Amino acid sequence: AWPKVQPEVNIGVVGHVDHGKTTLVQAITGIWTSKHSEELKRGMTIKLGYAETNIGVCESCKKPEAYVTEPSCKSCGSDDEPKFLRRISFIDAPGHEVLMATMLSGAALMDGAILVVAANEPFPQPQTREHFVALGIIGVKNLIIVQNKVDVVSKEEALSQYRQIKQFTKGTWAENVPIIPVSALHKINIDSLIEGIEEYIKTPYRDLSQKPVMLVIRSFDVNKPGTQFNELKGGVIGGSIIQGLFKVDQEIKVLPGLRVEKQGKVSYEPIFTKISSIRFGDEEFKEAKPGGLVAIGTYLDPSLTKADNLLGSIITLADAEVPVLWNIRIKYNLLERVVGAKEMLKVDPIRAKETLMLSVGSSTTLGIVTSVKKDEIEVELRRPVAVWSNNIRTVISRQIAGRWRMIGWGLVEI
Numbered sequence: 001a002w003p004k005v006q007p008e009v010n011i012g013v014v015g016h017v018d019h020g021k022t023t024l025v026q027a028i029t030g031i032w033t034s035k036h037s038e039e040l041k042r043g044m045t046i047k048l049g050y051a052e053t054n055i056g057v058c059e060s061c062k063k064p065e066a067y068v069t070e071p072s073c074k075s076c077g078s079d080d081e082p083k084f085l086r087r088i089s090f091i092d093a094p095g096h097e098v099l100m101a102t103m104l105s106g107a108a109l110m111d112g113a114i115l116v117v118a119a120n121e122p123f124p125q126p127q128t129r130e131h132f133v134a135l136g137i138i139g140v141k142n143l144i145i146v147q148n149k150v151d152v153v154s155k156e157e158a159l160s161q162y163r164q165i166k167q168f169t170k171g172t173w174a175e176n177v178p179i180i181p182v183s184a185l186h187k188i189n190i191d192s193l194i195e196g197i198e199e200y201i202k203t204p205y206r207d208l209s210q211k212p213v214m215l216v217i218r219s220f221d222v223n224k225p226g227t228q229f230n231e232l233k234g235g236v237i238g239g240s241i242i243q244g245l246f247k248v249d250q251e252i253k254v255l256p257g258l259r260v261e262k263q264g265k266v267s268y269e270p271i272f273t274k275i276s277s278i279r280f281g282d283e284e285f286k287e288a289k290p291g292g293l294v295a296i297g298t299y300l301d302p303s304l305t306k307a308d309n310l311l312g313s314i315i316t317l318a319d320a321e322v323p324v325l326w327n328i329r330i331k332y333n334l335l336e337r338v339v340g341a342k343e344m345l346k347v348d349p350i351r352a353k354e355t356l357m358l359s360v361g362s363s364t365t366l367g368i369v370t371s372v373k374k375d376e377i378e379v380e381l382r383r384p385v386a387v388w389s390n391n392i393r394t395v396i397s398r399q400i401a402g403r404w405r406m407i408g409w410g411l412v413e414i
């Protein structure tokens, strides 16, 4: 049989609202991310859609038809069980997509991505352009561009758009990003895309020795009304593990931790607890490595997690040595101009004393610029951030319009 393992890679599906995301993830996993089917034990997030599936391959059959997401090769001859390759995950935003602190969270999480393009829409729609830059900012490594709705246009028209795309990434990092044409609605050429993600979005190297770090993006009080006091469960923490691994029964801590305001002065003292359980989807595990969205059971007073109280925090082992700074130094790189409302907009260089919004992992706090230089700036922060590794990508954003907007990215230096 195939093994009941956990996902080992996260793929985010980004698509201009109405190009195919929700349906495309379904054509692959067989699940509908956005609005869906179970909560009694089905993995949930702050708001974003999420789905997982196994990936296999039939040894006898030819490709791409040989890739399967289920343990069967009948579809092409064999009564033989196909070869398992890996279990994967998909994340996307329900009938929408950026939401501004969401696209920033899903960044330290995404291992690769998929840009959905409607084949019956002139390329590139505005929202696609910004998705495109957002991905560059985010540092999206492995990318695949999917030409959706290809079944509603002619081969020639599809080809026409194909070129437009190829000659839009003609001079960017996307230079070679593959373009795969499909129909998520009617499921057409879906097998090629699965080949395409097996080739272009490979599972990243995993140094299992690195110190464990998980980004918290969800947390709650699982207890239902009526629960008896001696029978209630500890708080629960949903997040994605970035590096290392966590095991049930390990002592851990939450950073920055608990916000305490003694003497009218704010300050955060880390929150300690132990892992009571690890769950991926609806199945329990012993350990939790990077890949997929994991649910961690603790021994925390439900008041602590209740209603995503711990969102933006990170979990590490109790003795892990992780700074928690209220002032950080960032080696940055801005954008020349941002996708403005009308047509464009030019970004002003970082001016001192102006308030910005940085993203660190699943964190997003506002800070005041205290220092500003060619390649570096320093900022005071409203709330502190845990810095588990040296250079951790950060996303600088400015309330350009009336709405915050990415204006560059940088590395947190310590």
Ligand SMILES: Nc1nc2c(ncn2[C@@H]2O[C@H](COP(=O)(O)OP(=O)(O)NP(=O)(O)O)[C@@H](O)[C@H]2O)c(=O)[nH]1
Pocket: 039, 040, 041, 042, 043, 044, 220, 221, 222, 223, 224, 236, 277, 278, 279, 281, 295, 296, 297, 306, 307
């Ligand atoms: N690791 C782990 N995860 C669990 C356990 N029990 C439940 N979960 C997680 O809890 C999730 C569902 O949470 P949910 O019941 O919707 O929280 P809630 O009851 O809406 N919080 P509230 O009652 O304040 O509205 C599932 O996706 C599942 O993974 C457990 O014992 N261990």
Ligand SMILES: Nc1nc2c(ncn2[C@@H]2O[C@H](COP(=O)(O)OP(=O)(O)O)[C@@H](O)[C@H]2O)c(=O)[nH]1
Pocket: 015, 016, 017, 018, 019, 020, 021, 022, 023, 024, 093, 094, 095, 096, 148, 149, 150, 151, 152, 182, 183, 184, 185, 186
């Ligand atoms: N013809 C065609 N229609 C599609 C395809 N994928 C999705 N659709 C249509 O678009 C709708 C879903 O749009 P949706 O995926 O929710 O937009 P999103 O939430 O931004 O991803 C469905 O009602 C489908 O009828 C496709 O591959 N081909």
